[PDB]
Amino acid sequence: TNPTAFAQTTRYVKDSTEMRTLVLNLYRRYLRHSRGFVNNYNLDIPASQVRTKIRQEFERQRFVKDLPLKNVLYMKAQMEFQELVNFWKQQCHVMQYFESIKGDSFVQKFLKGAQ
Amino acid sequence: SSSIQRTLRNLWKNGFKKSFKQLQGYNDIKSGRLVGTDSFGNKFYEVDDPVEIHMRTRFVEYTGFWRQDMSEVEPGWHYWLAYGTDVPPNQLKPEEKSVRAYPVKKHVPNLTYTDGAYVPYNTARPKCATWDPKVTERP
Amino acid sequence: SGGPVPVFKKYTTGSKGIWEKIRQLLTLVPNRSTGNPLVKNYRVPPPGYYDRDHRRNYPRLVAFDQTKV
Amino acid sequence: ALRRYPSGEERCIACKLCEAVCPAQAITIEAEERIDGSRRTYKYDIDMTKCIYCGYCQESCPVDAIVETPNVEYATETREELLYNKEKLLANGDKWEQEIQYALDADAPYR
Amino acid sequence: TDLAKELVSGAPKELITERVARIYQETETWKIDWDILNKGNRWENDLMGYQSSSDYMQGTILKFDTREGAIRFAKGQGWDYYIQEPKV
Amino acid sequence: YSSDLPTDIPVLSKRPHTNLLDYTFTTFDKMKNWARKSSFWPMTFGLACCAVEMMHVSAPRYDQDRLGIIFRASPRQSDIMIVAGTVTNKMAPALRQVYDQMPYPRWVISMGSCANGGGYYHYSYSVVRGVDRIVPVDIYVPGCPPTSEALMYGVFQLQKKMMDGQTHRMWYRSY
Amino acid sequence: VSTFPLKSDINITKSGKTLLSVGQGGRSSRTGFTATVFGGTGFLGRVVVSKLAKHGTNVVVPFRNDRARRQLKVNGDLGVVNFVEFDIRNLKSIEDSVKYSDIVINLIGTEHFSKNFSIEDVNIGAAERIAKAAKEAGVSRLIHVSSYNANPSSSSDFYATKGIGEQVVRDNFGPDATIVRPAPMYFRNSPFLNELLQIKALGGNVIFKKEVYPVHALQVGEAIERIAFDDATAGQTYELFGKERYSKKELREMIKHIIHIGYYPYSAGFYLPAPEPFLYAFALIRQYISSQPRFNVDQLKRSHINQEIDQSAKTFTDLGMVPDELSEYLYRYVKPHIQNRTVYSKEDIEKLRDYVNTP
Amino acid sequence: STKELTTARIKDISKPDENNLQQQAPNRISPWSKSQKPRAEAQDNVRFAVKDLAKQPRPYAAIDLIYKQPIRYIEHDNVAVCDGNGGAQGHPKVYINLDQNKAIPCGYCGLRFAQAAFKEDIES
Ligand SMILES: NC(=O)C1=CN([C@@H]2O[C@H](COP(=O)(O)OP(=O)(O)OC[C@H]3O[C@@H](n4cnc5c(N)ncnc54)[C@H](OP(=O)(O)O)[C@@H]3O)[C@@H](O)[C@H]2O)C=CC1
Ligand SMILES: CCCCCCCCCCCC(=O)OC[C@H](COP(=O)(O)OCC[N+](C)(C)C)OC(=O)CCCCCCCCCCC
Ligand code: SF4
Ligand code: SF4
Ligand code: SF4
Ligand SMILES: [Zn+2]
């Protein structure tokens, strides 16, 4: 058995500081492959746009607190990196990943049906 | 079973007209004892040759010349052509037949790709009934 | 014991006449059949409380831990 | 296919045994009191695109009202034609009645 | 209880906020199910009268064993809930 | 401007041949459709238990080859696509890529319950409920699995549709 | 689109029918309407039909080509998309597609006359029969699509007949009818762009000097969708166009530069200076020898006429929609025809546009 | 006539016609259930525009083929046994008490019974 490209062992990290440095390198890894993600998936958005969306992704969830839940968030984000870099997700899924997305007053929701 | 000896015997017995019909849809000139026709018109034959293979001892000759549709086969005979019964539907004893209180009109095939195609619809009324407008004036 | 068996002991289409002797001279193994089934025999006629209870007495579920061990 | 008595009255009395057994949940039954009062059903739909031709239709009936004919050549151009309402099921029940007689009377001993 | 496990369960954002789960008892165990949607829970399909639905939690029921066990679960997932005490 | 459109002129599928050109372009349509009616080359897109029946048609008992049916693996060489078996969500994007690569004319046959409307796995979190959400379908074969004759019947009905094509007469009369 | 298109769940049409929408706006939801989209199998129809079906409106699509209607059924659910075989010369088949229809949309419009129809017979004769027949069946709303330069007195056959198409409808359907004028739309397989991408474009200088106001076809696709669900927009005239002005010759070199197409443009046939009589003669000769719709004499005149905005009409903002510019979408729609891909973003189209204008 | 076609009734005042495609069934006009949707209403849908109504499935109504059948009679007994009248391929056997003085239908077949004495009284 030979593990695939961009693989890491699943390890239960027992340090607060080490997890901080692991994440920081990971964020650079996404930015390094910014040009590739455009050329691999033929995305309509340019390289700067992907970095902008990646930053919006990394900025979004930086305030988590639980270390047992830090490793889980680092584990699955590693899988997202591994799936994307190995060119595993189809073209459509990446296009729709960035294509997702102010509310309305009570009268507006009352009339049509609300939820 | 496939050699020209069988084909020539089946060619001569059937005559040119019937055989040429088999040379247009069947692609295999075959002969056999006629066992009767259904309401639609298909003629159901059985072969008495000792050379035919196991599953080819019962066949049909459709009414059409250019196009053949399997659904034209009447359901009573359709079970006989499938080797599920030794008693042809025209030889049933009356204690076994189907007796219906409603008319049994001509057979109708499957009606896809034509305007006679079956259309599903909901047989149940809406479960909520709205209110009829009614006004009585101030006394 | 599944030893070799002649052609005429297998329910299959055979050879009638001199063609049988032609077949036995050309075919490498004369005791093999063509595999076509016998139309005259194969599928010729078509197909047309407590004393007796055990589930309630199923073996029980007992776990043995360090205390009982 | 939905069967029918020789006297003409529907065999089916709307158990909803049909809706319960169906592994693919392809049977939809709604029933009420008829005008004569005898218990019958006004809605009986099969989603032949959802059915698995399992056979629990035929086994569940205490009156042999729903049976599966030996027919297979009913492919349709539009998928809408594959939603069988009650009338389509009753049409087949009359259209295939004599054939179903062959099937049942040849499988009676083993049931 | 203090853990924001909703970021690992993968559930949609609407379960945390816009849905309410009832912890009831039908006679020895407790169950959890989600209260029905305001609109779009059940609309009659205009083709064949099928009971259509957009609620994806209508068919979900969780069989628990003890009350505090169910409450532990609801707090663990970050679920809004209320408890219905059975009548004696 | 000056315009006068009649009203009793019928539709194409009902319009009888009137002049000699209406017989010429009917000859071209039959000759061209007869070629596609006979050289019926589907694509081996077997996915699930429905795929066993699609093999048994090629078996010596039925011998699809006698009718001019030769399965071609590549989409380019295949003018039909028999979608047999469950179409999971993980497959649906891939199925569209295979379908879009078939040069025109192209037909799709949906065999079995899973390909038609979801089938047994209709309430599954990872099963497309009917392949008709992804690719247009020209004929639906019902079964689980449809018998080897049911698929042949479905093939025949689609053949009867192809022989009804009226493209080159449509240019003369409807275009 | 978003999640649910209807402004209110219950909408009463001009005919008194009370339609209640159900569901949260998914594929299995409904809106209770029945929008007959004439000419739905065309370029514009496949967008009009798609949006109507996904939100639950029954669509009756009358077609004359049998093999082109198959793909329209994917968009809707079971029974949502319906088909009627018809021809404009078969009046009875027209009345089959309007009997149950609460919305009737007209998209039929040609630029080339054939051996069976003239330009008038389609932009008028079809429109007149369609509009008048719809009224007799109590159709609540009619929506029509004409040229972007409709003019009754224009010397161009397309513009002259399209303008008369506006009059003849309003004398047949009545005050309720609506007229929408779309600018040249750009989308996948857009006839507006397919002329620019063609390598052998004889008379390329003459054809491409015309001016336009390109509009994104999706917005026009939603523009009819917004109008369809609203009764407030009866009896109006709408002209839909894009803010930033572009010309074909400006686009043709902009298009070619993205595809990077030294000696090649001079040889393959990109620039074919041909005499004006030859272009007029070539179009006439093919008009009797061709079998597929080619470049027409009418488009020789239209190349000399620039697009005109009519102030009596109403813009996108009248419907609450802001039109999108060709700059934000021109690259992706020619991305099929194009080391490291250079994605020409919205702003960078100007910098490309700068490079074209510089001598 | 837009009145009985959309109303449930015990019988039909008018004599039905086999060739009327607006009736609920060829042998009955008014529907035989309060919740059953009248056939005239259903066929007034979008999908029946070009589809031919002649070929649509119109099975004969059940509530008539039974009432044509004459009522069975029992002589010198007050318990009626009915098990489908077909052998072992019928409905489960049921016993019908004949104490009440009218025609009491079977549970499944819908067949009606009587006694010897009340034969003249019930037929009235
Ligand atoms: N961006 C654009 O495309 C432009 C839009 N417009 C106008 O908008 C309107 C929408 O047309 P569009 O879809 O964009 O382009 P198309 O020419 O492809 O649309 C033509 C539609 O109308 C049908 N049609 C044409 N002639 C007939 C006829 N005799 N009988 C029956 N049907 C006929 C066609 O049927 P079928 O295809 O099935 O044979 C098709 O459905 C047109 O009038 C167009 O001139 C104005 C300038 C350019
Ligand atoms: C030089 C080029 C290469 C060779 C060209 C030939 C290739 C094969 C052609 C296939 C034809 C085909 O398919 O004809 C067969 C199809 C099949 O009938 P159907 O489709 O069900 O319609 C027929 C039924 N109707 C019309 C009622 C719906 O029509 C025909 O029966 C056509 C009529 C028979 C024509 C006989 C007279 C003409 C003889 C011409 C030969 C001397
Ligand atoms: S045969 Fe089909 S419809 Fe009948 S119970 Fe089985 S799965 Fe359900
Ligand atoms: S089991 Fe028989 S009687 Fe009961 S609901 Fe099904 S078909 Fe009707
Ligand atoms: S329809 Fe039945 S046989 Fe076919 S793939 Fe699905 S489960 Fe298997
Ligand atoms: Zn009984």
mmCIF file of C-alpha atoms in Angstrom, chain F residues 1-13 15 33 36 99 105-107 132-136 138 161 165-167 170-175, chain G residues 27 64-67 70-71 74 78 85-93 114-117 120-121 124-126 129 154 156-157 160-161 164 290-291:
data_model
loop_
_atom_site.group_PDB
_atom_site.id
_atom_site.type_symbol
_atom_site.label_atom_id
_atom_site.label_comp_id
_atom_site.label_asym_id
_atom_site.label_seq_id
_atom_site.Cartn_x
_atom_site.Cartn_y
_atom_site.Cartn_z
ATOM 1 C CA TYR F 1 -47.158 44.540 -45.802
ATOM 2 C CA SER F 2 -49.179 41.869 -47.611
ATOM 3 C CA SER F 3 -49.740 38.565 -45.811
ATOM 4 C CA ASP F 4 -52.282 35.750 -46.060
ATOM 5 C CA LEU F 5 -51.745 32.537 -44.084
ATOM 6 C CA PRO F 6 -54.242 29.703 -44.658
ATOM 7 C CA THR F 7 -55.801 27.785 -41.764
ATOM 8 C CA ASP F 8 -56.639 24.248 -42.956
ATOM 9 C CA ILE F 9 -53.063 23.252 -43.838
ATOM 10 C CA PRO F 10 -52.272 20.361 -41.465
ATOM 11 C CA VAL F 11 -49.262 19.617 -39.260
ATOM 12 C CA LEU F 12 -46.186 17.798 -40.554
ATOM 13 C CA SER F 13 -46.857 14.385 -39.001
ATOM 14 C CA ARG F 15 -49.579 16.099 -43.905
ATOM 15 C CA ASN F 33 -33.717 6.695 -40.929
ATOM 16 C CA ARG F 36 -30.107 4.603 -38.149
ATOM 17 C CA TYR F 99 -24.252 12.438 -22.828
ATOM 18 C CA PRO F 105 -28.642 12.511 -33.718
ATOM 19 C CA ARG F 106 -28.721 11.035 -30.206
ATOM 20 C CA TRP F 107 -31.250 9.063 -28.176
ATOM 21 C CA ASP F 132 -34.778 12.575 -16.395
ATOM 22 C CA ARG F 133 -33.558 15.378 -14.117
ATOM 23 C CA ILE F 134 -30.200 15.189 -15.948
ATOM 24 C CA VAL F 135 -30.661 13.933 -19.511
ATOM 25 C CA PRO F 136 -33.707 13.933 -21.823
ATOM 26 C CA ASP F 138 -36.971 9.066 -25.329
ATOM 27 C CA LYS F 161 -40.125 6.289 -33.633
ATOM 28 C CA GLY F 165 -38.511 10.843 -38.511
ATOM 29 C CA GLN F 166 -39.330 13.448 -41.157
ATOM 30 C CA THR F 167 -36.341 15.794 -41.056
ATOM 31 C CA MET F 170 -39.592 19.196 -42.603
ATOM 32 C CA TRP F 171 -37.191 21.500 -44.434
ATOM 33 C CA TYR F 172 -39.375 21.326 -47.539
ATOM 34 C CA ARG F 173 -42.741 21.758 -45.809
ATOM 35 C CA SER F 174 -42.288 23.084 -42.254
ATOM 36 C CA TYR F 175 -39.278 25.356 -42.844
ATOM 37 C CA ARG G 27 -38.844 21.748 -8.695
ATOM 38 C CA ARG G 64 -42.598 22.332 -35.467
ATOM 39 C CA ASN G 65 -39.295 20.451 -35.035
ATOM 40 C CA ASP G 66 -39.768 17.142 -33.240
ATOM 41 C CA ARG G 67 -36.164 16.464 -32.216
ATOM 42 C CA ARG G 70 -36.938 16.751 -26.199
ATOM 43 C CA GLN G 71 -34.474 18.766 -24.115
ATOM 44 C CA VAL G 74 -35.710 18.303 -18.324
ATOM 45 C CA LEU G 78 -43.773 15.568 -14.428
ATOM 46 C CA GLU G 85 -47.372 20.044 -32.607
ATOM 47 C CA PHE G 86 -48.394 23.002 -34.731
ATOM 48 C CA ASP G 87 -47.730 25.245 -37.696
ATOM 49 C CA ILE G 88 -48.697 28.888 -38.113
ATOM 50 C CA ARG G 89 -50.781 27.783 -41.099
ATOM 51 C CA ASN G 90 -52.749 25.351 -38.884
ATOM 52 C CA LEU G 91 -55.221 27.491 -36.948
ATOM 53 C CA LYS G 92 -56.672 24.558 -35.000
ATOM 54 C CA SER G 93 -53.267 23.602 -33.586
ATOM 55 C CA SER G 114 -37.839 30.914 -46.852
ATOM 56 C CA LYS G 115 -39.604 28.970 -49.593
ATOM 57 C CA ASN G 116 -42.594 28.716 -47.260
ATOM 58 C CA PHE G 117 -42.682 32.000 -45.301
ATOM 59 C CA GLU G 120 -43.980 39.661 -43.002
ATOM 60 C CA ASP G 121 -45.759 36.297 -42.769
ATOM 61 C CA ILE G 124 -46.916 39.733 -38.575
ATOM 62 C CA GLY G 125 -48.903 36.810 -39.943
ATOM 63 C CA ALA G 126 -47.824 34.498 -37.143
ATOM 64 C CA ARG G 129 -52.965 34.928 -35.706
ATOM 65 C CA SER G 154 -38.282 51.629 -42.102
ATOM 66 C CA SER G 156 -35.372 47.354 -43.714
ATOM 67 C CA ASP G 157 -37.792 44.451 -44.109
ATOM 68 C CA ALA G 160 -40.682 47.333 -41.066
ATOM 69 C CA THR G 161 -42.518 44.055 -40.444
ATOM 70 C CA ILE G 164 -46.262 46.467 -38.052
ATOM 71 C CA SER G 290 -28.669 27.546 -50.284
ATOM 72 C CA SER G 291 -30.609 25.117 -48.116
#
